[PDB]
């Protein structure tokens, strides 16, 4: 289990806030790219924001995306959105958390 990652994020996303999401990976030497994405929940269909991030020893395999949830893109109405998927996708891993 040498190849590993951490994506770290605010405990709670503020709507309309510009939120800076940072990623570190370990046990990698070939430079590779990942995308960190904010997607509708549970269906993951609509994407509120996405950030391509490149990882290399040139970055010491560290980077961040600035991602935001513009308030009109939420469906709104009587039931406001309580939860949203944060996602990361790469050649090596894919994960999402509510």
């Amino acid at each position: 289990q040498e190849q590993t990652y951490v994506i770290s994020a605010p405990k709670i996303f503020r709507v309309g806030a510009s939120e800076n999401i940072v990623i570190q990976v370990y046990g990698y030497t070939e430079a590779f790219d990942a995308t960190i994405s904010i997607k509708s929940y549970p269906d993951k269909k609509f994407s509120y924001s996405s950030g391509h991030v490149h990882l290399s020893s040139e970055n010491k395999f560290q980077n961040s995306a600035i991602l935001t949830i513009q308030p009109k893109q939420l469906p709104g109405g009587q039931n406001p959105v309580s939860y949203v998927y944060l996602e990361v996708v790469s050649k090596h891993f894919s994960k999402s958390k509510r």
């Binding site: 289990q1 040498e2 590993t4 990652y5 951490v6 994506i7 770290s8 994020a9 605010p10 405990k11 709670i12 570190q24 370990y26 046990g27 944060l86 990361v88 891993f93 994960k95 958390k97």
Partner: protein
């Protein structure tokens, strides 16, 4: 041994910032995320460094005296001004100045609680106000948003206005006829924030 965190405490850090340090160690075969954090108390300071003063400085003025006022700033700014008589606050025992607590109120935005540390990596991140996705055998789903609450002419008012200060401005105006200490207070605003 490791490079220290040698960094400028830039203006964005005021009034408070939190430092979290972390690594993953692969162990023999199983990774572990190791982290620690500390609350860093920062000097309360404005980004505009805005200052306001009476250019004809005097210990006391006479009623109706014409005066000049200067607003000076490190950058171009809006400023609101207002004047209020001190007997007004004298009316109510324990009256509050409306711009009191502004930094402590801004601090209520901070998602963390406690001064740092934690029972665990997950606990460290949660108390730091973060969450994390990792395969390194830890998850923040162990914890929840508990209510953590640990401790770390004779007008009454005039000059109620807003002005642009293109780095500098000068105003000229007449005092009222009342006798008192007038408290003149103002708030600078720009894309650099409040002062």
């Amino acid at each position: 041994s490791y490079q220290s965190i040698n960094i400028p405490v830039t203006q964005n850090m005021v009034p408070s910032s939190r430092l979290l340090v972390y690594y993953i160690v692969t162990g023999e075969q199983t990774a572990e995320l190791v982290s620690d954090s500390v609350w860093l108390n920062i000097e309360e300071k404005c980004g505009n460094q805005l200052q306001v003063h009476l250019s004809p400085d005097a210990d006391a003025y006479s009623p109706g005296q014409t005066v000049s006022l200067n607003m000076a700033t490190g950058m171009d700014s809006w400023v609101a001004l207002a004047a209020v008589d001190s007997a007004v606050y004298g009316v109510q025992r324990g009256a509050k100045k409306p711009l009191e607590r502004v930094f402590q109120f801004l601090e209520k935005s901070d998602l963390g609680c406690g001064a740092g540390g934690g029972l665990n990596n997950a606990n460290v991140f949660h108390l730091a106000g973060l969450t994390f996705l990792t395969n390194a055998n830890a998850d923040d789903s162990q914890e929840n948003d508990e209510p953590c609450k640990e401790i770390l002419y004779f007008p009454e008012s005039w000059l109620w206005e807003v002005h642009l200060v293109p780095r500098r401005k000068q105003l000229q105006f007449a005092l009222p006829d009342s006798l008192t200490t007038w408290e003149i207070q103002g708030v600078g605003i720009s894309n650099t924030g409040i002062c």
